[PDB]
Symmetry: C3
């Protein structure tokens, strides 16, 4: 394995880091100062966390995943997971041609769309997917592999495609299993 030690970790300088947080040494963490991580979290190789990013507990950010929180930030609630090679954007430039583009160029010439991105509890994003700014992913939502998400998504559904369409209900058993797991944790 490739993860930082508890020793190495406290030395990163996160706004917050819980316990049993496993982080690849091969990930990239920009501005840990604005990054909070709960407990039981895994962040694999070649991830990039940048800007404002909050992660709860029980979350795997699989390899190659980029979270660009910029300023408004990205929030994951507990039991959210993100599969490989996913990108989440809290800010994006305007593609229309009404705006010059990117970090090379002064702000006034651009027309950056920005907006908090939220992943609620039990959201799972499949591999190679893309989430855009200002998007709340509803509790329980499953998004398929190679998905593109530009708009908010209603609780407890499964979505696929570019851009995603609602294809079926997500089952809630998962909520019973969460309840059980916490109780095994209990007494």
């Amino acid at each position: 394995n490739s993860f930082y030690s508890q020793e190495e970790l406290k030395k990163i300088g996160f706004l917050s880091v819980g316990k049993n947080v496993l982080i690849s040494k091969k990930a990239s963490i920009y501005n840990p100062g604005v990054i909070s991580i709960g407990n039981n979290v895994r962040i694999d190789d070649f991830c990039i966390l940048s800007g404002k990013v909050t992660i709860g507990s029980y979350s795997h950010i699989a390899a190659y995943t980029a979270l660009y929180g910029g300023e408004v930030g990205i929030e994951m609630y507990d039991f959210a997971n993100i599969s490989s090679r996913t990108i989440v954007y809290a800010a994006i430039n305007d593609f229309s041609g009404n705006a010059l583009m990117g970090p090379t160029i002064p702000n006034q010439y651009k027309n950056v769309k920005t907006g908090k991105v939220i992943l609620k509890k039990h959201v799972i994003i499949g591999a190679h997917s893309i989430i855009f700014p200002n998007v709340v992913i509803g509790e329980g939502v499953a998004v398929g592999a190679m998905s593109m998400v530009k708009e908010s998504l209603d609780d407890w559904y499964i979505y696929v495609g570019v851009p995603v369409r609602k294809i079926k209900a997500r089952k809630r058993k998962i909520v019973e299993l969460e309840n059980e797991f916490l109780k095994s944790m209990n007494s």
Copy 2:
């Protein structure tokens, strides 16, 4: 370039690693102990090889490619190649809502689907593709870029889309070139 010396290879300790095997120091190899590698194989920057993976000979695995063989294994026969940024999964979690998810939770609470992934000879996988567990990709199968493969695939066909659909037969002239090529050695 960015490859191991033949020297340093030996110091990784694969189940087995043949000759003329170029593997980027920028790859991530986990649990080399269950990975074997034949001859004339290139693995490029930022690849990941995890768990049980078996690569024959004359195979390129291109940059960013993730092979997660876990316990059941991925296996690739000779002259099989994978283009950049592919993921081969020998194990996936249940997305239905019937299970809790990922490596952060106990296995009683989950419903991991698992099953060996094999790519037969002369298989080519296009870039940005995803092969899920329990899939035999038949000999001479070509899968297009940006494709997703959840079921086994018939021999000598070209497949594309998400999930893939069969679009036409692959030419087999490469059988000849294999023969003619092995010949001259």
Copy 3:
């Protein structure tokens, strides 16, 4: 941030490299002697530039992006930007079954398709996209996320899909702004 200093850049040995140039140390650069960079370029972690590549000025190459310039080359012009996880190939292997495949194999048995690739001014390439060889992406072209490009694209259009299709005109307003920005300089 993971960038080289003005200093270390000079040691890399780029054909040419201008000012305000930030390249990630996490990037891989092969054969930097055929690679050339204007001014006010940014190249992010995990990018790969390989063989012949030429970038003008005011361009961002975002993270994970692979540019395989080969011998023919890839050229971007001023104000072209490329989003994350893109790949641009100036050379590719033939999938049809008429040839054997990849770098593990002698040229005489392959059937490499190759040709210069060009991104004209103001091109924007969407995240997770692929550009095949021998194409010109028209001036002012935007190509959506997760799109695949196999042919030259007409100027001032937005294209999406796999492979792309034209969906609407790109506003030419950016020309005004390019002037206004450059005037102000």
